Amino acid sequence: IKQKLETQFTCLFCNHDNSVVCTLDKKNSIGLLECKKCNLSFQAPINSLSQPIDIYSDWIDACE
């Protein structure tokens, strides 16, 4: 099911707090991070135990 989450994670490119949305999409183990200012997209598979923070750490590692 589609899950909207205006979580307060900090973005790296636009560097705007609470501009990061960690949508949760469990149907096919797919994880999207939606940003509001620079509107970048991050993809990552999400397991049963995955959490917005898990996607955030994956994205942080990806950025560098």
Partner 1 sequence: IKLYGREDKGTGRTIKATLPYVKQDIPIVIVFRALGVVPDGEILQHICYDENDWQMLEMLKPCIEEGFVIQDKEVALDFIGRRGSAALGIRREKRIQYAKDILQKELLPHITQEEGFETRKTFFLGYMVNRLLLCALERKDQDDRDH
Sequence letter at residue 8: Q
Least distance to Zn ion from the beta carbon of 13, Å? 5
Cα separation of 16 and 8, whole Å? 10
Q: Which of residues 19-58 bind partner 1 (CB under 8 A)?
A: 47-49, 51, 53-54, 56-57
35 binds Zn ion (CB under 5 A): yes
**Phi and psi torsions of 23, nearest 5°:** -65, 145
Question: 38: annotated binding-site residue?
Answer: yes
Least distance to partner 1 from the beta carbon of 9, Å? 6
- Could you tell me if 27 and 17 are in contact, meaning their C-beta atoms sit under 8 angstroms apart? no
Residue positions forming the annotated binding site for Zn(2+) = 11, 14, 35, 38
